[PDB]
Design a protein around this ligand. Structure first.
Ligand code: HEM
Ligand SMILES: [Ca+2]
Ligand SMILES: [Ca+2]
Length: 304
């Protein structure tokens, strides 16, 4: 039974240590926060929030890091190991990698202006990984509302939960290819997605030609690119949602989620509160406790 003081005696100043690490790691990278959060997300949806995603390729394991949604996309496993190293120098093999990811996501929010909350801890690391599962569990951006809702149900999350965690896109980056299909030829129609702001449609065609020498980066939130706030929901009202799965929350005739987007864009505090709740719920998926699993000494390889 996960408890926020699971380390009260075991690792007294756990939080202070990891907080410091993530803070210095931002002196040169104002994106590591968003990167760390999304990392905790990709862990939970596959096999459970058990760090299974941080495992590298072995003669015995085929890393999830090579699945369609992970390859050439997720980042920051480096800053992740720096945390482990510093935590170990204080609490020799007592804190799990799994928990470290969960603590990073909360700290990231606080460090970006967003809300905070007491993180329940006590999970244990796994001994396996599942690449194929990864491909069939993480939602893709070209999914329609029906599809998105179903993917969250598999995890035990509802419609509110879906629209609430999408707020994570209030900061961070995304490569051209992930949304370019709605810039020139949507649905084989030869024309741009009719639900994308025309002004933005230009700025975007600028950053993402119809053929260049590679994938350029662009902010998920044109309003407040690095700050955690309800701007992401406001943007939807003016058709400025970057990804296809973002806009669909508001521009899907019929809706169900529309009143919720409206609700949030109005009262940021309201949005903030559902979040704290939703993040806790997600951090409880397929957890390993008590004597299950182990305490990894190095987050990239299993003990031995
Ligand atoms: C509901 C389905 C979701 C879809 C379809 C989705 C899709 C994406 C895609 C395609 C990218 C960017 C393209 C790339 O860089 O390769 C991305 C980035 C991001 N997503 Fe999501 N995402 C989803 C849910 C979430 C959730 C639940 C969170 C966390 C609460 C989240 C947090 C982020 C962050 C912070 C980034 C950028 C991180 C960075 O800059 O490295 N996403 N997402
Ligand atoms: Ca996992
Ligand atoms: Ca923002």
């Amino acid at each position: 039974q996960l408890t926020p003081t699971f380390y009260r005696e075991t690792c007294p100043n756990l939080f202070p240590i990891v907080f410091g690490v993530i803070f210095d790691a931002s002196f040169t990278d104002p994106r590591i926060g968003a990167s760390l959060m999304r990392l905790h997300f990709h862990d939970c949806f596959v096999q459970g929030c058990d760090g299974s995603v941080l495992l590298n390729n072995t003669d015995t394991i085929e890393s999830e890091q090579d699945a369609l949604p992970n390859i050439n996309s997720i980042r920051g496993l480096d800053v992740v190991n720096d945390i482990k190293t510093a935590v170990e120098n204080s609490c020799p093999d007592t804190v799990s990698c799994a928990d470290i990811l969960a603590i990073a996501a909360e700290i990231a929010s606080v460090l970006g202006g967003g809300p905070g909350w007491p993180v329940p801890l006590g999970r244990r690391d796994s001994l396996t990984a599942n690449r194929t599962l990864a491909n069939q569990n993480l939602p893709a951006p070209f999914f329609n509302l029906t599809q998105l809702k179903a993917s969250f149900a598999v995890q035990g999350l509802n419609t509110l939960d879906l629209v609430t965690l999408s707020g994570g896109h209030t900061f961070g980056r995304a490569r051209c290819s992930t949304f370019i299909n709605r810039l020139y030829n949507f649905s084989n129609t030869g024309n741009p997605d009719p639900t994308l702001n025309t002004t933005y449609l230009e700025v975007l065609r600028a950053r993402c030609p119809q053929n260049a020498t590679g994938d350029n980066l662009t902010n998920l939130d044109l309003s407040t690119p690095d700050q955690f706030d309800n701007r992401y929901y406001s943007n939807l009202l003016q058709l400025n949602g970057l990804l296809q799965s973002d806009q669909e929350l508001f521009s899907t005739p019929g809706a169900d989620t529309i009143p919720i987007v409206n609700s949030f864009s109005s009262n940021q505090n309201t949005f903030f509160s559902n979040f704290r709740v939703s993040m806790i719920k997600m951090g409880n998926i397929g957890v390993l406790t008590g004597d299950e699993g182990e305490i990894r000494l190095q987050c990239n390889f299993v003990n031995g």
